Point group: D2
Chain length 119, copies 4
């Protein structure tokens, strides 16, 4: 619920995710990327199950790779589950999609998986 999720997290590549879980199931924050065309901080928005069922808490968020300094013409979404305890982790799968011409659309989307550790 709010506090579990709210906080600073890092993935296995050294990117940072700062998130506030709101009472209505809203997720807002900032993302700072360890890779790609990514310079500085980017806004993030998402949603989580604010009334979860030993099972994890399902959540997802999106970043569009545009800030006041750069624009990668691409957006990533991460879908996963928050698993609490002392070992708090967020286990995700993500899709990165770039804006493409129609011809190149077949190769517009990357897929990968990230694990977030809470700090």
């Amino acid at each position: 619920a709010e506090a579990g999720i709210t906080g600073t997290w890092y993935n296995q590549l050294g990117s940072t995710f700062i998130v506030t879980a709101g009472a209505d199931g809203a997720l807002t924050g900032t993302y700072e990327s360890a890779v790609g065309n990514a310079e500085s901080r980017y806004v993030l928005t998402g949603r989580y199950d604010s009334a979860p069922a030993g099972s994890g808490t399902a959540l997802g968020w999106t970043v569009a790779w545009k800030n006041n300094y750069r624009n990668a013409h691409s957006a990533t979404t991460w879908s996963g589950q928050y698993v609490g305890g002392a070992e708090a982790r967020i286990n995700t799968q993500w899709l990165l999609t770039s804006g493409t011409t129609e011809a190149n659309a077949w190769k517009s989307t990357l897929v990968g998986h990230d694990t977030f550790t809470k700090v």
Copy 2:
């Protein structure tokens, strides 16, 4: 286009996505196949389609499916505007079942 995106859309199975695209890159609206709140972002200065993504947690006042889907794709405008997507649906699971927690698929939305 910002307000190119703004509107009501439908996918292949009859689900309906109502969205507003903000000047600064925000997407907000509701998804129904009952109704759920969505939030996302899009490139507000595209070159190419416009990249975008959004999430829906499957909980509202009536049901809680303890899952959340994210759609990642691009908007292509023109005479017949479309949003081509791939999505990941993750369910809250115990550790024993975490390996079978995520479904993947694709959706094509149109104004029709």
Copy 3:
């Protein structure tokens, strides 16, 4: 159907898949958009579509793209038989770039 699967198929972009389905569950054949060898398996006793998958390493006598695609899906027979798939294309990369090694997409093949 074993020999329901056997035949020549085309996807949305004009690639052509020539396949033979063996009695015991083997798939063999070639894929061309030049030609590459494919191998896979399918459920030879289906209930529902027939589950199946195949791989193509993108190397032949003429080119080597140092990648390999796998297609996972099901065969649906009837008047207009189709093979609905999702695929993963992985490229051989250095460790620095391993996070951007895999493309995901979907393909629909038909006899037309």
Copy 4:
């Protein structure tokens, strides 16, 4: 090349994969599953880049979940790269597809990632 790949491997869930890499780029072997409707050994087939480029070697394989004892009406494909050294590993992403009725086709496919360690 052949020998690098050829051998016995296990994933993080305790499944086993026994594979022989052939000279023409063929992969044949057997898979024994730690989960699902999966009883005993199942045949596998796939392909690999027999002439790879510090970069890994791209490969993929499929198992249909049918043997003489069980049938799950489903097939999985794993796509990834073999990374050699002492730390030999195969890093993959997989798609599991079940045979479904048309109505249920939207939820026929699972996605996940596995890491294989050589034994």
